[PDB]
Curated annotation (Swiss-Prot):
This is Nuclear receptor ROR-gamma. It is found in: Nucleus. Belongs to the nuclear hormone receptor family. NR1 subfamily. Nuclear receptor that binds DNA as a monomer to ROR response elements (RORE) containing a single core motif half-site 5'-AGGTCA-3' preceded by a short A-T-rich sequence. Key regulator of cellular differentiation, immunity, peripheral circadian rhythm as well as lipid, steroid, xenobiotics and glucose metabolism. Considered to have intrinsic transcriptional activity, have some natural ligands like oxysterols that act as agonists (25-hydroxycholesterol) or inverse agonists (7-oxygenated sterols), enhancing or repressing the transcriptional activity, respectively. It comes from Homo sapiens (Human). Isoform 1 is widely expressed in many tissues, including liver and adipose, and highly expressed in skeletal muscle. Isoform 2 is primarily expressed in immature thymocytes. It is linked to Immunodeficiency 42: An autosomal recessive primary immunodeficiency characterized by increased susceptibility to concomitant candidiasis and mycobacteriosis. Candidiasis is characterized by persistent and/or recurrent infections of the skin, nails and mucous membranes caused by organisms of the genus Candida. Mycobacteriosis is characterized by infections caused by moderately virulent mycobacterial species, such as Bacillus Calmette-Guerin (BCG) vaccine, environmental non-tuberculous mycobacteria, and by the more virulent Mycobacterium tuberculosis.
Length: 241
């Protein structure tokens, strides 16, 4: 019918094509949990091996988010400066939101390298407080039981934010943002899910968590540079040095 029903469909399709891990796989695998022996195996790995592994997974996760963004109506018609401003500010925020699908609140585990494990899996990295904060964020989000379409629409909005500093064509970003806001709000009304609005994270929370996360990734990358399977030169250039 309207532009807006079509926009819901195209955002959800973009998400489906880029969600990386299927929800029904993630749910089915919840009973597949790392054994005590497997956990010890991970805890004994070098900090630097765990860093290599996690950095590679995080890179790949960011690439799926970039592909998601590229498929959002109007995103590719933004100027390249603005595309990069949006991705730099938002792509890791989206990854952190996407985690909640892979997180099981019943036992505080995340799907990692084919089974579920708790935060203690990552002991060798020596960032227990940061990791705990990330797990807690996913735990808060878990309680919403976000649907796949809610995740799609919400994460589109994490990216398409006209308030990011440094945008050159702010009105163009505003147009996209308003349409996405309408799509999300329409969809929540249609599905009797508007109750989630008051339960979503305060925006400051996601921003500060992400900033802390990226800061730690930068520290590790300075200490122990990784090989990146780089697909997006303008974005790579902004994050790596
Ligand atoms: O394919 C490409 O070209 C490409 C380009 C950039 C990429 N990600 C960059 C990262 C990383 C990060 C990661 Cl994921 C791992 C190790 C070290 C880092 C470091 F912090 F060092 F950058 N952290 O946040 C972002 C990010 C991206 C957008 N907003 C935030 C990923 C793939
Ligand atoms: C600060 C870093 C050095 C260590 C970060 C440790 C985390 C929080 O312990 C990371 C390590 C690997 C990360 C995961 C890598 C890949 C994915 C798939 C993506 O679709 C959702 C997020 C998800 C599931 C990540 C969530 C957070 C993880 C699970």
């Amino acid at each position: 019918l309207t532009e807006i029903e079509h926009l819901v469909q195209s955002v959800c399709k973009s998400y489906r094509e880029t969600c990386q891990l299927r929800l029904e796989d993630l749910l089915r695998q919840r009973s597949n949990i790392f054994s005590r022996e497997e956990v010890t195996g991970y805890q004994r790995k070098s900090m630097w091996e765990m860093w290599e592994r996690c950095a590679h997974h995080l890179t790949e996760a960011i690439q799926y988010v970039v592909e998601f963004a590229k498929r959002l109506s109007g995103f590719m018609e933004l100027c390249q400066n603005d595309q990069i401003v949006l991705l730099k500010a938002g792509a890791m925020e989206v990854v952190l939101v996407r985690m909640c699908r892979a997180y099981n609140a019943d036992n505080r585990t995340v799907f990692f390298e084919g089974k579920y494990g708790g935060m203690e899996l990552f002991r060798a990295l020596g960032c227990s407080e940061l990791i705990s904060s990330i797990f807690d964020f996913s735990h808060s989000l878990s309680a919403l039981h976000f649907s796949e379409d809610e995740i799609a629409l919400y994460t589109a909005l994490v990216l398409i934010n006209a308030h990011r500093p440094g945008l050159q064509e702010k009105r163009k970003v505003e147009q996209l943002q308003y349409n996405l806001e309408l799509a999300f709000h329409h969809h929540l009304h249609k599905t009797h899910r508007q109750s989630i609005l008051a339960k979503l994270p305060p925006k400051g929370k996601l921003r500060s968590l992400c900033s802390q996360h990226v800061e730690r990734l930068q520290i590790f990358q300075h200490l122990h540079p990784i090989v990146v399977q780089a697909a997006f030169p303008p974005l790579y250039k902004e994050l790596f040095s």
